[PDB]
């Protein structure tokens, strides 16, 4: 597509020569004309092959690169510059090829985003495998980082305290619900907040409408190969750990009727009750 | 502290609704539906989309019919017992009406058309209508009071306003077809039975209409063309 405009020009001059004859002296200007056009067609084709392989390598890197925004965003910076060079030399059909490449990039951001959720879900549930369990018999160096990365959900702590014979949770299971989803929302922004490639970025002040889905890959969560199952898995983990903490907090709230191990962990969620444990012992 | 759940607009995420509402939590759930007044032409259609999606969700939930009849009895009891599950329609970015007066040459008739349609829809589903503008901070406290009233059973005293074009507030049970008939008087070119799509048109936004994919003719096809040209000569 990119060489479509240049190739037709040669066909036009070829079409012109198909009418010419040796008896005309128009052959000799034509010989000069065809050589220049064919010479340009060879050069620009050679330029694209160099650039296109770089873009092919760069997009391939997205599959195997580390799962962090900077690592992704750096890669998406390289590909944008190459496309800007394509826009800079005035190649044909660039939005189509860019639109195809843009679709391909989102697809790769789909699988990495799918891996990121599942790695995050494993970390949330405690099913994330520490690197101690990575088998040492596999002599192949595992330099290829995990496709889902190594999500680190900061340990969540809530407060179970009693104030004047009233037991309450300082961090509510609703704020725990808020916190746990907020940590998740950070992880999806590893991918969904990446810059979207624009064919006409190099045009500044171009009068084209740009929304967030145009600006970023906000639609990669719809490009998951496994569908929304990974996302459904991700939230399903949150409810259960929330649900057990809802259950675990309930049995302590039952002891309020007394008036009317010091901590427990649910994956990243931590509940601290050593303070209330003391007064429960005294009241009992 | 009331649990809040806002679903992604895409139906690709509709399956998340099971994590938002359950059998035990359904009576405790208050449903809020957003109506976009910056894009009024998709208001009714998107509203039926979301209401339908809620209908299939409650269909999947598999509640006993006795419990379903009990919930409907409670809801209708709340309905007729109104004097001066639940569903609450909130209109957002109503100040865009001021743009509609300029950009699309709207008048009070179009506003009567859309709000009469919305009130009739609310009657169809027995919902409460309110008009809001965060940009202008309109009816935010009224909204908050009404939510607290309907969820926690708190008191509520504000009366129903249906006169102001972009601040209409109709609590549950106030609306009726006879009460809706006041707007039909103000019509002078449209009729209450006239279609929504015909009177209010979806503008054809001037997106960058992409050009045809121009592709270089293959060597074989171009040379068959040249064969055709040479042969006739």
Convert A117-178 into a string of H (helix), E (strand) and C (coil): HHHHHHHHHCCCCCHHHCCCCCCCCCCCCCCCCCCCCCCEEEEEEECCCCEEECCCHHHHHH
Q: Is the separation of the CB atoms in B31 and B20 below 8 Å?
A: no
Instruction: List Cα–Cα distances, B172 to A93, B66, B101, B128, in angstroms.
Output: 57, 24, 30, 5
Q: Do residues A84 and A202 make contact, with C-beta atoms less than 8 angstroms apart?
A: yes
Name the residue facing B215 among A4, A174, A177 (closest C-beta). A4
**Tokens 């330029």 correspond to what residue?**
A47
Strand A269-272 to A156-162 pairing: parallel
B151 contact A CB<8A: no
Structure tokens at B31: 């449903």
Q: How many CB atoms lie within 10 A of CB A282?
A: 6
Q: Which residues contact B12 (CB under 8 A, 6 or more apart)?
A: A221, A222, A228
The answer to whether A66 and A149 are in contact (CB under 8 A) is yes
Q: Which residue of chain B is at minimal alpha-carbon distance from A94?
A: B213
For the CA atoms of chain B, what is the radius of gyration?
Answer: 25
- Nearest 5 degrees, angle CA A106-CA A112-CA A114? 100
Cβ-contact B100, B41 below 8 angstroms: no
Tokens 């969560």 identify what position? A221
Is-contact B165 B174, C-beta < 8 A?
Answer: no
Residues 6+ apart with CB under 8 A from B41: B197, B200, B201, B202, B203
- CB-based burial label for A108 (10 Å; 0-12, 13-18, 19+): buried
Contact A188, A117 (CB under 8 A): yes
Burial environment of residue B222 by CB neighbours within 10 A (0 to 12, 13 to 18, 19 or more): middle
B80 phi and psi angles, rounded to 5 deg: -70, -25
Rounded Cα–Cα distance for residues B78 and B87 (Å): 12
- Cβ within 8 Å, pair B12-A235: no
DSSP-based three-state secondary structure for B106:
coil
* Strands B31-36 vs B87-92: parallel, antiparallel or unpaired: parallel
Query: How many whole angstroms from its chain centre is CA A130?
Result: 23
DSSP state of A188: H
Q: Which residues of chain A does B208 touch, with a Cβ-Cβ cutoff of 8 Å?
A: 208
Rounded CA separation A140/A159 (Å): 46
Cα separation of B184 and B190, whole Å? 9
DSSP per-residue codes, B161-220: B-SSTT--EE-TTT--HHHHHHHHHH-SS--TTS-HHHHSPPP------PPP---PPPHH
- For residues A100 and A216, is the Cβ–Cβ distance under 8 A? no
Give the containing element (helix H, strand E) for A271: strand A269-272
Resolution (A): 4.4
| A201 contacts A80 by C-beta, under 8 angstroms | yes
Cα–Cα distance between A282 and B3 in angstroms, integer? 35
Is the Cβ–Cβ distance between A191 and A217 less than 8 Å? yes
Q: B19 and A18: CB-CB below 8 Å?
A: no
In B, minimum Cα distance to A234 occurs at B16
Q: Are A104 and A13 in contact (CB under 8 A)?
A: no
Contact A93, B214 (CB under 8 A): yes
Instruction: Write the CB contacts of A96 (distance below 8 Å, at least 6 apart in sequence).
Output: A1, B210, B213
Q: Nearest Cα to A34, choosing from A4, A11, A3, A61?
A: A11
- CB environment A202-237: b (16+ within 10 A), e (fewer): eeeeeeeeeeeeeebbbbbbebbeeebebbbbbbbb
Cβ atoms of A116 and A151 within 8 Å: the answer is yes
| Sheet hosting strand A167-169, strand order edge to edge | A167-169, A156-162, A269-272, A263-266
Residue A15 to residue B207, Cβ atoms within 8 A: no
**Encoded tokens for B177:** 């077809």
> Is B217 in the A-facing interface, judged by CB distances under 8 Å?
yes
Can you give the C-alpha Rg of chain A in angstroms? 30
Q: Which stretches of B37-188 are DSSP H helices?
A: 43-61, 65-80, 97-103, 108-125, 140-152, 177-186
Distances (CA, A) of A42 to A36, A82, B218: 10, 19, 17
Structural tokens at position A4: 């479509």
- Identify the residue whose tokens are 């929330």: A242
**Dihedral-angle region of residue A149 (phi above 0 means left; psi in -120 to 50 means alpha; beta otherwise):** left
Give the dihedral of Cα atoms A193, A195, A198, A200; nearest 10 deg: 120
Query: How far apart (Å, rounded) are the C-alpha atoms in residues A225 and A186?
Result: 21
Contact B129, B166 (CB under 8 A): no
Phi, psi of B129 (to 5 degrees): -100, 140
Chains A & B: contacts with CB separation below 8 Å: 49
DSSP 8-state class, residue A197: P
CA torsion A83-A89-A92-A93 (nearest 10°) is 20
Question: CA B51 to CA B32: how far, in whole Å?
Answer: 10
Residue B131, classed as helix, strand or coil, is strand
- Nearest neighbour of B208 by CB, restricted to A18, A208, A221: A208
Tell me the C-alpha to C-alpha distance, in Å, between residue A22 and each of A19, A29, A105. Answer: 10, 12, 53
- Angle (CA) B219-B225-B226 rounded to 5° is 85
What 3-state DSSP class applies to A64?
helix
For residues A239 and A236, what is the distance between their CA atoms, to the nearest angstrom?
Answer: 5
Do B207 and A209 lie within an 8 Å CB cutoff? yes
Burial of A141 (0-12, 13-18, 19+ CB in 10 A): exposed
Residues of B in contact with A200 (CB under 8 A): none
Tokens of A261: 């191990």
CA distance A112 to A220: 10
């Amino acid at each position: 597509l990119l060489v479509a405009g240049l190739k037709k020009e040669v066909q036009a001059l070829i079409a012109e020569g198909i009418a010419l004859v040796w008896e005309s002296y128009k052959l000799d200007p034509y010989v000069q004309r065809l050589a220049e056009t064919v010479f340009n067609f060879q050069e620009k084709v050679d330029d694209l092959l160099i650039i296109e392989e770089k873009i092919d390598l760069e997009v391939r890197s997205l599959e195997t690169c580390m799962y962090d925004h900077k690592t992704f965003s750096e890669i998406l910076n390289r590909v944008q510059k190459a496309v800007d060079d394509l826009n800079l030399h005035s190649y044909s059909n660039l939005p189509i090829w860019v639109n195809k490449l843009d679709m391909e990039i989102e697809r790769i951001l789909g699988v990495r985003l799918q891996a990121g959720l599942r790695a995050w879900t494993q970390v949330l549930l405690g099913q994330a495998e520490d690197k101690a369990e990575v088998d040492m018999d596999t002599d192949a160096p595992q330099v290829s980082h995990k496709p889902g990365g190594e999500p680190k959900i900061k340990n969540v702590v809530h407060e179970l305290r009693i104030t004047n014979q009233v037991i309450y949770l300082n961090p509510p299971i609703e704020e725990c619900r808020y916190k746990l989803y907020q940590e998740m929302f950070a992880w999806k922004m590893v991918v969904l907040s990446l810059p979207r490639i624009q064919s006409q970025r190099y045009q500044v002040g171009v009068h084209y409408e740009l929304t967030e889905e145009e600006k970023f890959y906000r639609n990669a969560l719809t490009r998951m190969p496994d569908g929304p199952v990974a996302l459904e898995e991700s939230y399903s983990a949150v409810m259960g750990i929330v649900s057990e903490v809802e259950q675990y907090v309930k049995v302590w709230l039952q002891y309020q009727c007394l008036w009317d191990e010091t901590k427990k962990e649910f994956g990243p969620v931590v509940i601290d009750y050593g303070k209330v444990q003391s007064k429960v012992n005294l009241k009992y | 502290r009331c649990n809040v759940w806002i679903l992604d607009g895409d139906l690709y995420h509709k399956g998340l609704l099971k994590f938002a509402v359950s059998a035990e939590s359904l009576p405790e759930t208050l449903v809020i539906f957003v109506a976009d007044m910056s894009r009024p032409w998709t208001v009714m259609e998107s509203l039926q989309k979301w209401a339908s999606v809620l209908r299939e969700h409650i269909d999947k939930m598999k509640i006993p019919p006795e419990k379903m009849r009990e919930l409907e009895r409670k809801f209708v009891k709340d309905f007729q017992d109104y004097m001066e599950i639940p569903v609450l329609v909130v209109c957002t970015k109503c100040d865009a009406v001021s743009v509609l007066e300029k950009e699309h040459d709207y008048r009070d008739e179009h506003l009567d058309f859309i709000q009469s349609h919305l009130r009739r829809f609310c009657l169809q589903y027995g919902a409460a209508l309110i008009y809001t503008s965060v940009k202008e901070e309109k009816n935010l406290d009224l909204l908050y009071k009404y939510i607290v009233h309907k969820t926690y059973g708190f008191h509520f005293t504000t009366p129903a306003l249906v006169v102001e074009k972009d601040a209409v507030f109709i609590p549950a049970g106030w609306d009726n077809e006879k009460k809706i008939a006041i707007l039909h008087e103000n019509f002078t070119t449209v009729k209450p039975e006239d279609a929504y799509e015909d009177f209010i048109v979806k503008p054809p936004v001037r997106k960058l209409v992409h050009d045809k994919e121009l592709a270089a003719e293959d060597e074989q096809v171009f040379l068959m063309k040249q064969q055709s040209l040479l042969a006739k000569q």
